[PDB]
Amino acid sequence: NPSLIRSESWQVYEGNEANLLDGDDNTGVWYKTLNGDTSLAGEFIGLDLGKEIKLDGIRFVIGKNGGGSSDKWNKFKLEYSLDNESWTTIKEYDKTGAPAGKDVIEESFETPISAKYIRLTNMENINKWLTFSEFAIVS
Ligand SMILES: [Ca+2]
Numbered sequence: 001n002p003s004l005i006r007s008e009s010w011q012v013y014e015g016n017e018a019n020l021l022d023g024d025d026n027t028g029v030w031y032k033t034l035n036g037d038t039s040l041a042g043e044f045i046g047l048d049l050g051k052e053i054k055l056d057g058i059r060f061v062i063g064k065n066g067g068g069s070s071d072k073w074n075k076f077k078l079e080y081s082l083d084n085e086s087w088t089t090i091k092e093y094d095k096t097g098a099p100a101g102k103d104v105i106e107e108s109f110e111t112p113i114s115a116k117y118i119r120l121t122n123m124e125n126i127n128k129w130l131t132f133s134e135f136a137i138v139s
C-alpha cells in the first residue's frame with residue numbers, strides 16, 4: 001500500500017493525512033504553509049509506492065470543499081522516480097483561474113511507467129496555504 005510523501009515544513013491545519021489515502025474524494029487535509037503563507041517552487045505531495053511498479057495511470061484530487069477551496073497551486077508538474085533522488089516529469093499543469101474546490105488530476109499511460117515514487121510538485125511560488133483530498137494510482 002502506498003504511503004504519503006510531502007514537504008516536511010507544512011503544518012496540518014485541518015483534517016488527517018490518512019484522509020488522503022482513504023479512497024474518498026470528500027475527505028481531505030488543509031496544510032498551512034510557512035515562509036509567509038507561501039508554497040515555494042519545489043514543494044510537493046504524492047506517494048511512496050514501497051517498490052517499483054508499473055503504473056497505468058494516476059488519479060489525484062487537489063483542493064477540497066469549503067475552507068481552503070481555492071488554496072491550490074497554480075503551476076505544478078506530475079513527476080516520478082525510481083530512487084527518490086532523480087525525477088522525471090510526466091505532465092506540467094497551469095490551473096490559474098480553475099474553479100474553487102476539488103480538482104481531479106487524472107492521467108492514463110498507454111504504455112505503463114515503472115515508478116517507486118510519484119508526486120505533484122509546485123513549479124512557481126504562490127502565496128497560499130494548500131488543500132488536498134486524495135492520491136491514488138492505477139496498476
Ligand atoms: Ca480522501
Ligand code: NA
Nearest residue numbers: 064065101102
Ligand atoms: Na469541492
